[PDB]
């Protein structure tokens, strides 16, 4: 949160060492809520 935002909405994490995209997160799946 050092950078609140660069005016561009991003849904993915990046590596702090080189900048490579680690993964992306948009929403929780929430489909295992119906169990048995």
């Amino acid at each position: 949160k050092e950078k609140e935002n660069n005016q561009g909405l991003i849904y993915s994490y990046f590596c702090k060492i080189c900048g490579e995209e680690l993964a992306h997160f948009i929403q929780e799946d929430r489909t295992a809520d119906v169990g048995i």
């Binding site: 949160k1 609140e4 935002n5 660069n6 005016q7 909405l9 994490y13 992306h24 997160f25 929780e28």
Partner: protein
Amino acid sequence: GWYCFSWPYRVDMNRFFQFYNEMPLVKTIAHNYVIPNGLNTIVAYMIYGGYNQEDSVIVSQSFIDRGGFAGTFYREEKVELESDIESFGKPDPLITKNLKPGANYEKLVDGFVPVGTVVKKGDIIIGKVAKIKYIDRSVMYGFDEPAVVDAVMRPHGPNDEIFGLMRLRYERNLNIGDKMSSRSGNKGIAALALPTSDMPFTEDGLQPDLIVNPHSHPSRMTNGQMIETTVGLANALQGVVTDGTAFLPINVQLLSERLAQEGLRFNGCQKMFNGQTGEYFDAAIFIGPTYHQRLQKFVLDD
């Protein structure tokens, strides 16, 4: 306009409260029962640079800065909880999971952003985590234009449970792309914003607030707008407010002669100069007060 007299007590969604409203110089009987909504903008019916073509208008920037068609726009955030699972609070990075990328959790105070701070895109306005260690079902402010947290409260719903209610306010001025309209149905989109020294001016110093194309009239035959400008031009100098209700007896020949009795021309046109060059036009330009109203279609939302 004044959409409600009890606006501060309400948390409403997509509501605009225009600060300044005026009774038309040519009012009707409908204004005895409802509050008029709009301003008596000085309108010039002229060709000025070609920026008002195809149903566009040219707006004075000074008129915008002074509060013309300016107001505040409101949005609401209503977030609910799951009974004893979720809670309101600031998450912590080392316990909670899958926090939203590029978020801003530091503005939360006891789960809610404090009233009066400016929240921009990417900021987390409401903190909410579900106990499984924790999963973060936070609420993030996904709007380009920054808002201001106006009111925060924690009411009890019909099920006797806490849900979060936040009111976000937007300081809205008239900007390029906002839709305005006259009372004759001639709507238009603000196209250009000129300073006070670039707008055309008369010999007596009068300058328009809106510059509308003269080509908007002949095909749509909105004669009531032109008669309103002629009547309203004499009302301002005479210091009166007259009634222009439909089906009342009028005589445009007599109304035009009324302008000359007030020191103006018969046709209401005046000598004007080009504000950019200082060069007078070789034609008297029809300029006068026409009641214009701002339609609630904001380019910042579309």
